[PDB]
Design a protein around this ligand. Structure first.
Ligand SMILES: *[C@@H](C(=O)N(CCC(N)=O)NC(=O)[C@H](Cc1ccccc1)NC(=O)[C@H](CC(C)C)NC(=O)OCc1ccccc1)[C@H](O)C(=O)OCC
Ligand SMILES: *[C@@H](C(=O)N(CCC(N)=O)NC(=O)[C@H](Cc1ccccc1)NC(=O)[C@H](CC(C)C)NC(=O)OCc1ccccc1)[C@H](O)C(=O)OCC
Lengths: 306, 306
């Protein structure tokens, strides 16, 4: 019993973290096989963070311009290239600790674990969701660029995020492991802002199923709704529209709890309209939107507490 | 910027997790040097979970009654003993991956990371606090007994919890790594209940400092309070009393933000008395009590966003 945001155990990714230094800049990198990946802004200098031209900043770099440090050991750089907003440095050595891994591009509303690192040294791990506005609400201080986000299935690490920037509202922006940003952001210190965000409807509904699977039914009601009517109320509250795909995704949870998805929507549409005020759901006031239906299945019992 | 519950990276503890089987029971253990530690209830049988006599259940066990499995490898058991509510099994082998470690007995209000494991296989990590009523609000399903809680400073793992039981309210109970329970609980399936819990005042105040360090001042006020007057209001709301020790602990945060602790108490005493209703603090409605002043210092910037 219990329901907690939880991260994947971080050990397979700790054995991949290194420190990359170019000049007086040090930031984190990710060593997998014989390659180190890191934000290309490692090559910026203090005086040009506004409009760096990376292609031009890089052609002035050689292999011995980069030092890669793994533990107390120095990795020799034997080639480099840029890929989108990342650099790929070839090192002497293949990392004995490389796990099975994939690189994947996570989709808004999905969740992943962040391993926050400074100077190549892991300091903490936490779960977060890719927001609909393509930023994440992370927790990162100076030196965290290069920290990665990932998910793990069986023995395989699916890397999905490398950290790059913080935006004025204190939320965070970064790229996939091919160096393509999430969202419209760019790796320069020019004014950028997160676009308005929206609540992730699919996740809020999932988390209502988890509350029920765990034993709470208080927020239910005897009413049903049309997808279309629900979506009218969602607009008003700044929720993403619910699509039939989202409804189908929620099938297994609906089946385990015996509550039809559109009955759960009417319950949400009543929480939205009438408030919670006085009562929590799984320890929370505020409808929580950072758990996927997959995260609820992974973590809850397969047997409903009826 | 940002503020997130975060766990310590879990890799050093993943390399310590094994599976211990006695009969048809399998649960997790913790291998450190040449010893495996696990809940003694691994020796219970289906028909006596109410009143097992462990001393008598154990004298009927030999070394070859236990199988210890590390990865695909079998560890031979070469001696065993009981210690309080744990067994210590000596294995053939010293674990090559033992980190520097200590065993410590965490104190109520402190926080630690739990690595949830099933069958010796880590599945997730999350942060939780030792509640004043000596249970933790964890998230654990059948097979999680033996999962551990820990903190890490530098290279050293301080183990503080091994999981044993779930109580009817869905909260959790367990022991230190010397096998002494936290709280008045016992390792048998006889009726037990968590005592009434209380909110952890020191942590709520810490988290008000973190909100300020991050840049929010909304809940402040022009008023001050007496420790004693604050405590009157704390009783009414079911908060632990605030002691001068707690006040001294909060000094560094007070100094970084320039808000006197007793001014922060008056602000809390006004949140308590007037509600939050409409506004959040670091993303939360509900005053959060699962971050220590040490966890806020570890995670926030050292420079206040004034
Ligand atoms: C890199 C690092 O630690 N971080 C993470 C910061 C954090 N708290 O998450 N990354 C950076 O600091 C960015 C460095 C940079 C990136 C591209 C090009 C040049 C430099 N910069 C920022 O994240 C910056 C804010 C910092 C807190 C100052 N963000 C923006 O400028 O966003 C755009 C913007 C919006 C509004 C007004 C102005 C700008 C680590 O710092 C490092 O090694 O840096 C080397 C460059
Ligand atoms: C051990 C295991 O996975 N867990 C963790 C359970 C969880 N979800 O956290 N531990 C147990 O299940 C306990 C097993 C046990 C302990 C001592 C002696 C004999 C057996 N039992 C419980 O935790 C049990 C509840 C279970 C969900 C059934 N708790 C209590 O009975 O609490 C006291 C009580 C209160 C009110 C009424 C009755 C009892 C894993 O299950 C294993 O290997 O078990 C081997 C014994």
């Amino acid at each position: 019993s219990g329901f907690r945001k939880m991260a994947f155990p971080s050990g397979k990714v700790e054995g991949c973290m290194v420190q990359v230094t170019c000049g007086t800049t040090t930031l984190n990198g990710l060593w997998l096989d014989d390659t180190v990946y890191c934000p290309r802004h490692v090559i910026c200098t203090a005086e040009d963070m506004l409009n760096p031209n990376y292609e031009d900043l890089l052609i002035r770099k050689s292999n011995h311009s980069f030092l890669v440090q793994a533990g107390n050991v120095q990795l020799r750089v034997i080639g480099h290239s840029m890929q989108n907003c990342l650099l790929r440095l070839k090192v002497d050595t293949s990392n004995p600790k490389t796990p099975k891994y994939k690189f994947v591009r996570i989709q808004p509303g999905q969740t992943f674990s962040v391993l926050a690192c400074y100077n190549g040294s892991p300091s903490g791990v936490y779960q977060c969701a890719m927001r609909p506005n393509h930023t994440i609400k992370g927790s990162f201080l100076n030196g965290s660029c290069g920290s990665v986000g990932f998910n793990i299935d069986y023995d395989c690490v699916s890397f999905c995020y490398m950290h790059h920037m913080e935006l004025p509202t204190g939320v965070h922006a970064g790229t996939d492991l091919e160096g393509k940003f999430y969202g419209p952001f760019v790796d320069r210190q020019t004014a950028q802002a997160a676009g308005t965000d929206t609540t992730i409807t699919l996740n809020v509904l999932a988390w209502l199923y988890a509350a029920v699977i765990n034993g709470d039914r208080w927020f239910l009601n005897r009413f049903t709704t049309t997808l279309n009517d629900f979506n009218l109320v969602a607009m008003k509250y700044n929720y993403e529209p619910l699509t039939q795909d989202h409804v189908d995704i929620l099938g297994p949870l609906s089946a385990q709890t015996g509550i039809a998805v559109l009955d759960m929507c009417a319950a949400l549409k009543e929480l939205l309209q009438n408030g919670m005020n006085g009562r929590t759901i799984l320890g929370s006031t505020i409808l929580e939107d950072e758990f996927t239906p997959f995260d609820v299945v992974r973590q809850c019992s397969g047997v409903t507490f009826q």
